[PDB]
Design an enzyme around this catalytic site. Structure first.
Site, PDB file in Angstrom:
ATOM      1  N   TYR A 104      11.224 -18.037  11.166  1.00  0.00           N
ATOM      2  CA  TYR A 104      11.996 -19.217  11.245  1.00  0.00           C
ATOM      3  C   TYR A 104      12.486 -19.624   9.839  1.00  0.00           C
ATOM      4  O   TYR A 104      12.009 -20.782   9.465  1.00  0.00           O
ATOM      5  CB  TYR A 104      11.178 -20.570  11.990  1.00  0.00           C
ATOM      6  N   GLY A 221      -4.077   1.117   0.496  1.00  0.00           N
ATOM      7  CA  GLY A 221      -5.108   0.392   1.244  1.00  0.00           C
ATOM      8  C   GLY A 221      -6.190   0.443   0.924  1.00  0.00           C
ATOM      9  O   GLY A 221      -6.303  -0.338  -0.281  1.00  0.00           O
ATOM     10  N   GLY A 248      -0.805 -11.022   2.286  1.00  0.00           N
ATOM     11  CA  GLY A 248      -0.716 -11.553   0.996  1.00  0.00           C
ATOM     12  C   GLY A 248      -1.769 -10.724  -0.068  1.00  0.00           C
ATOM     13  O   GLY A 248      -1.650 -10.933  -1.329  1.00  0.00           O
ATOM     14  N   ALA A 249      -2.423  -9.717   0.397  1.00  0.00           N
ATOM     15  CA  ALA A 249      -2.974  -8.940  -0.570  1.00  0.00           C
ATOM     16  C   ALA A 249      -2.323  -8.101  -1.482  1.00  0.00           C
ATOM     17  O   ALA A 249      -2.784  -7.898  -2.558  1.00  0.00           O
ATOM     18  CB  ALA A 249      -4.221  -7.805   0.412  1.00  0.00           C
ATOM     19  N   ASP A 251       0.499  -8.503  -2.580  1.00  0.00           N
ATOM     20  CA  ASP A 251       1.130  -9.512  -3.705  1.00  0.00           C
ATOM     21  C   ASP A 251      -0.115  -9.939  -4.686  1.00  0.00           C
ATOM     22  O   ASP A 251       0.350  -9.994  -5.840  1.00  0.00           O
ATOM     23  CB  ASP A 251       1.511 -11.166  -2.917  1.00  0.00           C
TER      24      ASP A 251
HETATM   25  N1  ATP Z   1     -10.294  -4.340   2.362  1.00  0.00           N
HETATM   26  C1  ATP Z   1      -9.822  -4.161   1.337  1.00  0.00           C
HETATM   27  N2  ATP Z   1     -10.667  -3.981   0.328  1.00  0.00           N
HETATM   28  C2  ATP Z   1     -10.221  -4.009  -1.146  1.00  0.00           C
HETATM   29  N3  ATP Z   1      -8.866  -3.910  -1.517  1.00  0.00           N
HETATM   30  C3  ATP Z   1      -8.044  -4.176  -0.263  1.00  0.00           C
HETATM   31  C4  ATP Z   1      -8.309  -4.352   0.989  1.00  0.00           C
HETATM   32  N4  ATP Z   1      -7.166  -4.486   1.701  1.00  0.00           N
HETATM   33  C5  ATP Z   1      -6.325  -4.412   1.119  1.00  0.00           C
HETATM   34  N5  ATP Z   1      -6.552  -4.343  -0.140  1.00  0.00           N
HETATM   35  C6  ATP Z   1      -5.871  -4.061  -1.676  1.00  0.00           C
HETATM   36  O1  ATP Z   1      -4.430  -4.642  -1.370  1.00  0.00           O
HETATM   37  C7  ATP Z   1      -3.599  -3.444  -1.608  1.00  0.00           C
HETATM   38  C8  ATP Z   1      -3.036  -3.168  -0.260  1.00  0.00           C
HETATM   39  O2  ATP Z   1      -2.084  -4.021   0.136  1.00  0.00           O
HETATM   40  P1  ATP Z   1      -1.275  -3.480   1.010  1.00  0.00           P
HETATM   41  O3  ATP Z   1      -0.869  -1.891   1.125  1.00  0.00           O
HETATM   42  O4  ATP Z   1      -1.908  -3.608   2.531  1.00  0.00           O
HETATM   43  O5  ATP Z   1       0.061  -4.036   1.148  1.00  0.00           O
HETATM   44  P2  ATP Z   1       0.099  -5.437   1.906  1.00  0.00           P
HETATM   45  O6  ATP Z   1      -1.100  -6.223   1.559  1.00  0.00           O
HETATM   46  O7  ATP Z   1       0.049  -5.272   3.386  1.00  0.00           O
HETATM   47  O8  ATP Z   1       1.438  -6.397   1.405  1.00  0.00           O
HETATM   48  P3  ATP Z   1       1.252  -8.037   1.935  1.00  0.00           P
HETATM   49  O9  ATP Z   1       0.371  -8.472   1.095  1.00  0.00           O
HETATM   50  O10 ATP Z   1       2.621  -8.380   1.529  1.00  0.00           O
HETATM   51  O11 ATP Z   1       1.127  -8.008   3.346  1.00  0.00           O
HETATM   52  C9  ATP Z   1      -4.463  -2.142  -1.845  1.00  0.00           C
HETATM   53  O12 ATP Z   1      -3.752  -1.303  -2.719  1.00  0.00           O
HETATM   54  C10 ATP Z   1      -5.841  -3.010  -2.277  1.00  0.00           C
HETATM   55  O13 ATP Z   1      -6.016  -2.924  -3.630  1.00  0.00           O
END
Ligand code: ATP
Ligand code: ATP
Ligand code: ATP
Ligand code: ATP
Ligand code: ATP
Ligand code: ATP
Lengths: 300, 300, 300, 300, 300, 300
Positions: A104, A221, A248-249, A251
């Site tokens: 939104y 990931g 947000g991970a 970012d």
């Molecule tokens: N369970 C986890 N343990 C450790 N690091 C993680 C974990 N999940 C995500 N991360 C970290 O986050 C980064 C991955 O993020 P990701 O590829 O999922 O993009 P995203 O988070 O989906 O983008 P956004 O934050 O905008 O949604 C990875 O390179 C990793 O360092």
């Protein structure tokens, strides 16, 4: 004197207390989100001098955003509440992992950003300028702004950091490639995820060759993430954690790397720092609530 | 065989747990709102055969709305989830009473409503057709629809019930007068509040003369409400209660009146019933959560 | 250029969700309190340029205080987190109104305040300097500081504003009289409540004669409050509201008066503004959570 | 006739609902803590006749403590609310595990404990007397009391159980060794963690030789724990569980062993029981909320 | 035209927010349970046309049940609120897994069910009829009803699905075998757990030979579950998940298989679907709150 | 040496967080209730030596009751957890005040009470014996017990105190009159409310003449309450408060009177004390959570 400057559209995240379809929830948690916003706060919490460029509506949510940014110590020299409304969205996490988001934000005060949204002399002496692929995908003005922004940065000797952050909701793979194909030249540091490269260049391989920037970081990931610097391919491993709210991970990941770069740290320590922040945010709810403070690193 | 048929745009209400500025809230309560939706449920709860005409988005909030309407036993023969999104809004109640509402409904699936949105033979044998002044204020299609709707009702011998419900946010006093001045002829029962009449016709007096419909009901807040039927001016007194969340009370009031009418009750009992529903909803949070059931009246 | 400068000990308030003896509570709400802190925020929210002088511990609560003050836009040029701990307290509101407070502040970083705690040239061009009788009651250093503070203000042409705020917990009526009898000369605006005057000078009458300052304001709870300016005795009436958490209302009242003074408003409007802030905070939980913003006045 | 008697300072634990820096929390959970208190309740829940010796302030928190101890069926023959206040502390668990605690107990009613705090004839016929290294570290009086306590126990044929529980906040490694070096002779059962031995005697090895008591139990976190009885070195493995709030688990561990001893159980079953209680408390929030009941063991 | 029809006694589940003995909880979550009810909703959520036969009391809980069933889109043609009360129960999950349930349903309106509780012509054209071993165990009337029900189904070419669901609380192993021994002939699809077979026929082996129905499904907890169809023994593996509240998972399991059967899916896909639903409910609190929707499968 | 001894059936109260129909609640508060249980705790809190006679089930709720009674310092020499279940009930408070209660107590362990349930020599030296009209209304055994109880008290020189507390749910007005007409002779102090007398004797007048006991106390809700002692008619006024959860107030009132009597206080002070307790509990949620402590009176 600021070290890092980011810009984009701030957002308010509405998230349920537990997993399950949205339709069945009676209470929602309110969080301050927005890719660049997450990065801004994450950096500030680590002691990095950072400023945030953007607009919010002249409403309560816009105010909410402003407090957080201010409370967190982000420079809002070119941030302000302007006429209009502040965008928001609703997240939904299903029992078996599959989520879904409802936005939104169309026509929000924040999606206005156009060329000249802030004074270029702001980027003077600044280490990096961070932008997400979400910004340009919002509107023709935003896309123009983005291009304009990284141009005034380069002109001021400011490295450009970009997190692809491809949104199927905003634009098509071609529109995205069309942009990248045009912006790529001014990018110094590029953040890209496996799925993204796959979804835009067929396979992680091609993407890397097509999007060959001075320094590319491929988020895998939990499989860590690779750092392609001087032809060298450094690898980094993610921290074993229980993914709570993965939003947000990525970012937070970017913010950890930038801080490492800002501090002139080895690629090994830049990756280490990045994976650390990504894990923390991943293991916590909200958009950037898990972001650690400098004092935490000091202790670890 | 339905007795009452209402139509409009459904909405989801986001309300904080207690008073205070929105920007300071961390959790919000989710409620299903929408003027005519409130009326629909209130009547169903009282055992009145009612149907609801409208659309919602193909999202989780639209689904949520669908369940409530279905769970409450409202006829959704002409209700459905269509492409688009379900509108929502955020309420805010301040310590000293002054509130403020934030909308996120523009361009929603529910604001589409246009002439022919449903099969006219639906209004066959129906006692009343209820519409709110909010509907026509949404778009040129909705205004046309409303006019169309009450036209097909009149031609089917269906009395038309209207609750002015003027929204400064949707249209100007003149645009509202312009509508009423055009729609008035087909109205059989009109619901109007003191502020509204004053805000549109200068003083409650003129308004009553200009908007002279077969039966007009002027809601006086807690000062009860007057019923102007056969030149007669019946008076009704509100129930002494502590206003918790006054939102949706007017809709609940209308529903109580209609039920009384549907049941062919004296003006005395129609007003009594109406004030009862208005009080109940007023003394409860949410848009129509306080609406009583038939079994409650039976006992009381 | 600051308009108002206040100083004292910041505190964190722990309050239960509802009335009832503390011993039966399982969850507590965390709030940022401290008389002069409440005043500082209240003024900032109204757009008044205000600075806050004080210290907090190098802990998480001290940090929390820091963010709120910063987020609210208070000038913390002479505020900082120093070694030691941040004081806190636990409030308790009983079913029938009688409350009880438990302190954990003795020896806190904030109770240190001594003469020279900040640079006097800070008070240059400042309209008012606000202090509470709680400050000097904390320690011999704090009492000396307070005296010192209002001395440097007077010599800088800065009017001194004082809110007696007598605490039976900190010092005896005589010790309080002893102070006032010593400080009174440098006071320009004095805030006093009926109970206080009665508890220190027998009856509200004597107190007013003994504590004859240029402008005295006697808070009468809900009975409004009187303004004794130029021999004139202006009266002001409180706003009808349901007292939720009366804590911090007196501080909010002072802030409303000061803002009015700072804005050179008539005594009528100064009292009106003061009673408005006092009511708002009274009708809300926390120490200063109910304080309104400039935009609220503008609209009201 | 009591089986076990423990003594020390009770504390109230304030803990956030989820991980994250304290500064950002708005709500806190209230729990009754205190090493010896945790052990007292854990024992009582298992049906062991236990008494608790100590003081609390004449406040609401002190009362709270008293109810819990009484509700849990602990003997408070020599426990009482005395003038002063009851100590409390605030815990903080960070996203990646690193925690931090803030105390507010200096000068509390409970830290008074001195020689003769209770009637020695209380220890008549008692199986064990349990004390923590936290007690003596509080004050010169407490240290004296501790020594005095275990002396009157030995004199009455009461085995002395001691849980080093070294607190860097209370005293230095040398002060701790100085105490142990002096108290050791009267100890019958000693509880020690790996870190502690390491932090006080360089390596787990030395510690064991220096602190050679009849029966020493080395807690190895999740690596179980070793039991050094008759020159024999029995090993015990911890229960696979997800550490929620690890606080109070060591105390629960001790209680499980004592119960096993009190019931004259084999070292294998004493270790089994101990690891069981440590796991339960570890997998639950609060200081001792996870402690199981006798009926639970019966069933398992 | 309905596909599946289930019947039994609905129940309201009262569950604490976290693990721990009931005696220490101050707040309880309210959920709508009942074996057959769980299956009914799970099926409806997947788009399967299902009806629910049963009674509830004329109370608030009975009403609550009715809303959920209606909201979820279950056919309540033969469901109704009748004189009497609606049964409820209280669950309790201990730190180390061991739970305990307390019932308050004896003599409830739902336990009345006797032969002829609904119109047999209801089962016309219906794919399956689902019943749980809980129903017959309630009363002599219920047992009679159950037998009667599956007899009218067979007579109408309706396959009979049965989930042993042995309750030690309702009847003894012999009474259970006595029933099975009598009902078995009319069963087409049988759901059985390892413990059950063990607890009733000594070992999983015997049970399978004694209870040889056309299609038997042996639930092995997380070890997946085996499908014995045409002499063939298909195996299925459970989805790796963190068991939150394992209650209602077996019912959800059954619903997944039935849906698969209803859709004429291979035994591999029927098992896959079943394990999917069992995992989702297992990983969520409440009796059937985790049940997925058709849209979820579509996406997965 | 006990002063007061009460007996009856303990109950667990399930109450929603706020007003509204039960069917719409998702969370409920757990409280320990039971008329005589409320009285027992209220007296204990005031320092009155009181014992409670009764039974509960061998379940978690029965345990919960046990802890509260023990924690509150009530003598449970003749109280215990016996086979069976602990009764519970669900309250429901509607927006406009009208409530409704749902019981789940029939056949509970506590409803067993029969003649000889405890050792008569327990009543030796006891000031009063308190019983409620709810006890005898439960079963023929309970009614016999009650008669038996007050018979053994009278023969021990123990004054009998009775609170009619008529429940339409338990027995008819005639059955109640039948009891009173039989028990009245042994009653020394009688508690009666206006509605009760009117519902059983037509008008408050007759009731007083028919039920002429040495000392009758007529509770008039907020209109205070009258004390009819020595032909004298003392009047008492209730404390102005906002009724939150009026449940348990009458029991609290009785407890305040008894304490006053036990302390040999004038009728003026007995009524004052009684109205004080009734107000406190009325202004708080739960069955007896608002009951004050001795220390509260001392201060007030
Ligand atoms: N369970 C986890 N343990 C450790 N690091 C993680 C974990 N999940 C995500 N991360 C970290 O986050 C980064 C991955 O993020 P990701 O590829 O999922 O993009 P995203 O988070 O989906 O983008 P956004 O934050 O905008 O949604 C990875 O390179 C990793 O360092
Ligand atoms: N405190 C109250 N006690 C009794 N009845 C009330 C109370 N507050 C509102 N009502 C009822 O509601 C009707 C008034 O509603 P009102 O005039 O406030 O329109 P409204 O509620 O603001 O419209 P909407 O429900 O869409 O917000 C009255 O005529 C009255 O019967
Ligand atoms: N219910 C109310 N309605 C309107 N104004 C109120 C109300 N309660 C308090 N106030 C305002 O607060 C001022 C009174 O505050 P008060 O005399 O109670 O000192 P205080 O609030 O107790 O001091 P502190 O805030 O430090 O606790 C009054 O003069 C009045 O303007
Ligand atoms: N995850 C776990 N699983 C099983 N047992 C555990 C777990 N965590 C802790 N324990 C038990 O607790 C004991 C360890 O406690 P620990 O060494 O951590 O002292 P502590 O708990 O930190 O002391 P305190 O309770 O005062 O904080 C171990 O010996 C073990 O039996
Ligand atoms: N952790 C889990 N992961 C995946 N599937 C699970 C899990 N726990 C349970 N299930 C599924 O639930 C089915 C097992 O249920 P189970 O044997 O426990 O009966 P039940 O759930 O106890 O019966 P009820 O639901 O009435 O309590 C299994 O066959 C499996 O498919
Ligand atoms: N708002 C109030 N203010 C002061 N006292 C009150 C209030 N409400 C109730 N009371 C006290 O409670 C006594 C009245 O109780 P009441 O007549 O309502 O019986 P009851 O409370 O309904 O019985 P029960 O507690 O078992 O439900 C009165 O005599 C009065 O002293």
């Amino acid at each position: 004197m600021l070290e890092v400057v980011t810009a984009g559209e701030p957002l308010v995240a509405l998230v349920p207390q537990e997993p399950g379809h949205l339709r069945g929830k009676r209470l929602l948690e309110v969080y301050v989100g927005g890719a660049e916003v997450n990065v801004a706060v994450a950096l500030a919490r680590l002691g990095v001098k950072v400023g945030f460029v953007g607009r919010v509506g002249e409403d309560e949510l816009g105010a909410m955003v402003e407090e957080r940014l201010r409370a967190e110590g982000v420079d809002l020299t070119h941030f302000r509440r302007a006429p209009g409304f502040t965008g928001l969205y609703l997240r939904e996490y299903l029992p078996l992992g599959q989520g879904r988001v409802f936005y939104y934000r169309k026509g929000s005060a924040g999606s206005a950003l156009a060329p000249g949204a802030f004074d270029p002399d702001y980027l003077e002496g600044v280490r990096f300028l961070h932008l997400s692929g979400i910004t340009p995908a919002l509107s023709p003005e935003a896309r123009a702004f983005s291009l304009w922004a990284m141009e005034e940065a380069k002109r001021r000797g400011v490295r450009v950091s970009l997190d692809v952050n491809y949104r199927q909701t905003l634009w098509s793979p071609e529109e995205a490639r069309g942009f990248l194909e045009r912006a790529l030249p001014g990018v110094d540091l590029l953040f890209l995820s496996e799925e993204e490269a796959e979804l835009l260049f067929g396979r992680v391989e091609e993407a890397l060759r097509a999007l060959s920037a001075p320094e590319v970081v491929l988020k895998r990931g939990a499989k860590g993430a690779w750092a392609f610097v001087d032809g060298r391919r450094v690898e980094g491993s993610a921290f074993a954690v229980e993914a709570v709210d993965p939003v947000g991970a990525g970012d937070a990941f970017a913010a950890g790397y930038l801080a490492g770069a800002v501090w002139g740290l080895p690629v090994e320590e830049r990756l280490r720092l990045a994976n650390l922040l990504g894990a923390s945010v991943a293991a916590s709810r909200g958009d950037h609530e898990g972001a650690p403070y400098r004092e935490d690193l000091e202790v670890l």
